[model samples]
Target: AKPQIPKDKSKVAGYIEIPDADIKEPVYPGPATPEQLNRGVSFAEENESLDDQNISIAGHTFIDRPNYQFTNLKAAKKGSMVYFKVGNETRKYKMTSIRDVKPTDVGVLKGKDKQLTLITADDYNEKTGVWEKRKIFVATEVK
Candidate 1:
């Protein structure tokens, strides 16, 4: 994974690569403030460290905007490989599950082991409102 390291690398958690979707995005730490969500992925929780288990990341999907962060996450497939790069180390994970869950479901973010959860908007639900949809990518660590 080629990390396009910014001038200030300290604020960056790492990089996430999904070759199948031709996606490479930077990771940032926080609860996904408006400033960070559009730029790249951010921690599902606030101020989380990189090495933490069950790392949950959230990003915005403009849905129609291809260049926006996580917009192509809908193209991701199960069993595809996902790469996570933190500094000089790159970890591999398999995209085991891509689930369509309720936006209020925090259950999807929970993982017992070291894994990565990628979340983005799936669709707009007029009944439940805009935040009613979620596409959750559960990637399990692989050798």
Candidate 2:
């Protein structure tokens, strides 16, 4: 089914939905600041718009709570479906790969083709007061 387009794109750039993970949330534009993340998943890059070949969105994690933001993404398995909704249209993608990379790995931010990169904290480092690693999910657009 096609998701409805947002009345105002300023507030919401689009949406990301994963039925297998039981996730459907609005994706805001701009970077994923702690405050913005509390609202929902957001674009991970600054000064970036939806007009890109590769889109990178990021969310948060809760060590204590079972559910929040991108937490359910952990359960989203390969071959499952991922949906992107925008401007009265919805595109389908199949989960192609998942990886755990250093939080500094910027390479994951780029994609070879039409891709949706969903990223989140793999684990928090209490000692450093930061995320220990990043769990990235890559979905390729399927025709």
Candidate 3:
């Protein structure tokens, strides 16, 4: 099955450890543009590190799966705190928006808008789980 939950499970209990940018190759070997496949990578889901952009992060509800995991992340209210560490840059982001989007929607493709984009999927229920509603958190770089 597809990834139907948030990437960082560790963040639930406390802070989710963000990986350093060292994992990011000098020549990032993923999608060149958001239109391409593969992007950057970061520590995700406890000990795992997926791509840095447009990832499989989502909010899981406790119906047939779990509840309120990444769901809350869907809409990070303004001033909400989000963190990620890349290489020597340990950065923080503040929420800007959280809304729903299409599964293949390339709204996240835009670049240089924020230091990092914290995303979550609302592709829930036994109806249509094809990457529907989304939780977008646009954050600026902070020391």
Q: Which stretches of candidate 3 lie over 4 Å from their true place?
A: 1-67, 86-89, 97-114, 124-129
- How good is model 3 by TM-score? 0.40
Ranking of all predicted structures according to TM-score, beginning with the best and ending with the worst: 2, 1, 3
Q: List, residue by residue over 1-143, the lDDT tens digit for candidate 3.
A: 32222333222211222222111111122111221112222122333233333332323222342223443343345666656443444446554443333333636433543445444443433454233444444555555
Candidate lDDT scores, in order, read 0.70, 0.71, 0.35
Pitting candidate 1 against candidate 2, the one with the higher lDDT is 2
Candidate 1: list runs displaced more than 4 Å: 1-10, 103-112, 121-133
Tell me the TM-score of each prediction against the true structure.
0.74, 0.76, 0.40
lDDT of 1 by residue, 39-132 (tens): 5677666645566667777777785778567778767778888998888789899887544344446453534557888877544455753434
**Candidate 3: global Cα-lDDT?**
0.35
For residue 82, give model 3's deviation from the true position in Å: 1.2
Sort the candidates on lDDT, descending order. 2, 1, 3
lDDT comparison, 1 vs 3, better candidate: 1
Q: What is the lDDT of residue 7 in candidate 3?
A: 38
